[PDB]
Design a protein around this ligand. Sequence first.
Ligand SMILES: OC[C@H]1O[C@H](O[C@H]2[C@H](O)[C@@H](O)[C@@H](O)O[C@@H]2CO)[C@H](O)[C@@H](O)[C@@H]1O
Ligand SMILES: [Ca+2]
Ligand SMILES: [Ca+2]
Ligand SMILES: [Cl-]
Length: 683
Amino acid sequence: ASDTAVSNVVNYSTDVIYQIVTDRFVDGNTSNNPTGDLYDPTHTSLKKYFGGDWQGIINKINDGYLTGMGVTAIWIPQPVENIYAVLPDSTFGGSTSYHGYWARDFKRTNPYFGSFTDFQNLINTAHAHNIKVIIDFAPNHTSPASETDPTYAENGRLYDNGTLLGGYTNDTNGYFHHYGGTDFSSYEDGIYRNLFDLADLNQQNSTIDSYLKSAIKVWLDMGIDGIRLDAVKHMPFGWQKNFMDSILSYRPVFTFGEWFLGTNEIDVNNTYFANESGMSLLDFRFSQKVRQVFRDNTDTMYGLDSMIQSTASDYNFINDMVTFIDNHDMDRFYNGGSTRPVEQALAFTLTSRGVPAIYYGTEQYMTGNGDPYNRAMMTSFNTSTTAYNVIKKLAPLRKSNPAIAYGTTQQRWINNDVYIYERKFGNNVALVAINRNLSTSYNITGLYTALPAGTYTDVLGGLLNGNSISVASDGSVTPFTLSAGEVAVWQYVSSSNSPLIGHVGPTMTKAGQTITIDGRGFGTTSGQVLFGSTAGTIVSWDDTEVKVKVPSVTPGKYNISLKTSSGATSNTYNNINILTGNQICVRFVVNNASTVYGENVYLTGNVAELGNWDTSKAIGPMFNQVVYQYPTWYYDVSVPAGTTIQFKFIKKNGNTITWEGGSNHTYTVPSSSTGTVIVNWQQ
Ligand SMILES: OC[C@H]1O[C@H](O[C@H]2[C@H](O)[C@@H](O)[C@@H](O)O[C@@H]2CO)[C@H](O)[C@@H](O)[C@@H]1O
Ligand SMILES: [Ca+2]
Ligand SMILES: [Ca+2]
Ligand SMILES: [Cl-]
């Protein structure tokens, strides 16, 4: 199988995701609809179940609507059993779990979407049509609850395949956090306090950790191809790294977290998470900038290019960034007026780096500002819209042109309104020109490109007013007019390739596990794959994909390279993390650690998971407000099972590091369950 095959579930860079809100798409079976106040057959009361289901999605796969658009993956809401209560709502009458994010049992289906057999039908129908299936999964919480009013909603009650574990009130088992609600003011505040009124799960509780691991395996065994993890800024990094290892050790799939960022928001924790968790991220930096530039007129093409360069610098795995222009929590991209801006934002996303996701109905110019107005019933299946055909023409290029799936991005021409950028992967090239100005054209002189000499036609065939260009041997492009609102795409795909790695997945692995290396020019005869300088054991070898067993190198990060059977060496794909063993989430606690203003406590120790005594990569700054209070500090950390670790705490600020004195602390990590280790600061 090639890199582009539907069965390659650790690489989505050649795919285009269509994000479906199941309840609001197609009602394929009326008999599974809720009855009573849960259900609105008129599709007008925007927080009720409208009846959209998995059979409905199946229908739109079988009848060619999605495939005719070039969709190759779908992302659906959390498939698990949700609460049945209808919550009072002063605007909408009642509020329901139609959206899937209010779980009551992570091991069973939402019967309104379908049974496990319906889910199986969806997976199988999608695969028969070369469509991958991603599920939303929301382990941060169950459902809306009030501790003082257990009659509200279902009091966050959680079941384990029908067996009640407990609820938010009288939580004697400590399955939930009881620290009030978050105000988003700090990382710590957002993790240990409730998101809104949602009953916050205590993943550090061994029963809950084990439960969530078991639950995701139910869905992996149903044949899912990917996971969108909800609210990842609201759970501990350490717990999620531990959770990811459980998934990747069982059957690896592409996983991407939702870490919400606002316009212009900077968050170093978001960077760290993308680089270290073992999962990818929804690209809110990309999305928010695209909205500023094309929708809301608050930045220029210079800002767009600055985002492209900054994200590339910050994120180790830029080809894994899941890009989008809107979603079910944002104002619909189309907002009235010309449809050209949304068409341009689509074209930009579809030809840019990462993994494009398109919110259902974008191709039908659906409008709606704010939740739930942005979640109306799918309006139309008209296949003649300009936007539908923009997607139809551009989506397949991620499969046919490796520059688009894997390539670097270089600015070739820029002003306030014009961005001409180049995607390049070896001798494969795509050149894209966009003029956002709807009234003014620009004269394009001094343009250069890596496209070979010749004349290139617009891949869009003039759909967005594009036209042909001529390129000379020195790369100079003959002057041309970029008309108002124009988008044009020009490309070259080489007939042969030197070995080039475009993707490695998963990025967090360990000895004996298998990783997938995708690209071009590997040849058909087996060669060598190197982890640094150490060879792995080849599982399978093809020109676009090599699978390899991870060798027993010292745990840490490794740069992957490939050598063909004739001895040609590829580029390196950096920062693949090799863990020490299967992971466990351990809460580290240190007492009596006094600090000065601006100084914080960090954890360091003698395994890769603790940075191997590297103080510049010590774990922290640690927390000291919610679970324990200063001068006690704490942090939840993913560490290798059954391993005897040595560790110390350090204090650092902006100049100078203070270590604990005395001998190292030592602790043997549990074999399977979560653990807590508590020590006193040693002078
Ligand atoms: O000619 C090489 C030059 O091309 C581009 O510069 C553009 C510039 O972006 C436009 O704003 C305008 O000034 O025309 C220039 C070409 O004459 C690239 O942006 C630049 O890096 C490159 O050196
Ligand atoms: Ca239905
Ligand atoms: Ca939480
Ligand atoms: Cl940015």
